[PDB]
């Protein structure tokens, strides 16, 4: 079994480093200087370094040449315990959700309609907006009359409103958000949010 080593790298850019190493090895396999790495591991949450499986640290250093992502770990590498091999390879794992990005991060969103297209789903959410008064905030009930009075980008359909950010609201935002842009498992609300929505 070839030894395993840790190579330091920039955090967050571990996915494409393996692809670039593949390209290097495939392009160099016909040349007189082939890459001698036996495998490369970049787990889901391991960040800042990548595991390399090769017979010697000399092979690692010779093969990882030309890759800028690992320049921090080019000169120094640490030894991966052999008893930790399996430790490398294990991974552990009308609803309510919470959005992941934007200004609406980490707030309750009630799944109103589930679209069978499996790209976006309908969510009712409390607008965190300033009603086009401050921007050239606390979760508060949407005000249709105030957003009609302040003007700007507004399309009115009685209880329906299309406003800044192409936001669709009724009576309360009702808009489509991606399934991967929300967390569909692990909300478990309390009674206060139910009133809002042993």
């Amino acid at each position: 079994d070839p030894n395993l080593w840790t190579v330091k790298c920039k955090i967050g850019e571990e996915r494409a480093t393996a692809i670039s190493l593949m390209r290097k090895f495939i392009a160099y396999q016909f040349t007189d200087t082939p890459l001698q790495i036996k495998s490369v591991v970049a787990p889901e949450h391991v960040k800042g370094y990548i595991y390399v499986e090769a017979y010697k640290q000399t092979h690692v250093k010779q093969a990882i040449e030309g890759v800028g992502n690992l320049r921090l770990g080019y000169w120094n590498q640490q030894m991966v315990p052999i008893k930790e091999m399996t430790d490398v390879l294990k991974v552990v794992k009308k609803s309510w959700v919470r959005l992941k990005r934007g200004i609406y991060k980490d707030d309750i969103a009630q799944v109103d309609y589930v679209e069978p297209s499996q790209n976006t789903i309908s969510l009712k959410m409390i607008p965190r907006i300033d009603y086009d008064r401050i921007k050239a905030p606390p979760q508060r009930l949407f005000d249709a009359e105030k957003i009609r009075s302040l003007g700007g980008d507004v399309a009115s359909d009685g209880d329906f409103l299309i406003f800044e950010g192409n936001r669709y609201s009724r009576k309360f935002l009702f808009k489509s958000f991606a399934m991967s842009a929300v967390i569909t498992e692990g909300v478990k609300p309390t009674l206060s949010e139910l009133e809002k929505f042993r």
Partner: protein, 48 residues
């Protein structure tokens, strides 16, 4: 560290985790350590 040991338990990132935690706790009460990097904020200034 708590969320790492909750699920991951990689047992090797844990070593560096506890090492850095020990360093932070030690420097919180003693910034002048023999042969250790000093604690500084985003100014280059050692802490008090």
């Amino acid at each position: 560290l708590r969320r790492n040991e909750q699920n991951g338990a990689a047992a090797h990132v844990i070593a560096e985790d506890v090492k850095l935690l020990q360093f932070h706790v030690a420097t919180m009460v003693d910034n002048e350590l023999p042969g250790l990097p000093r604690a500084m904020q985003k100014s280059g200034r050692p802490l008090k």
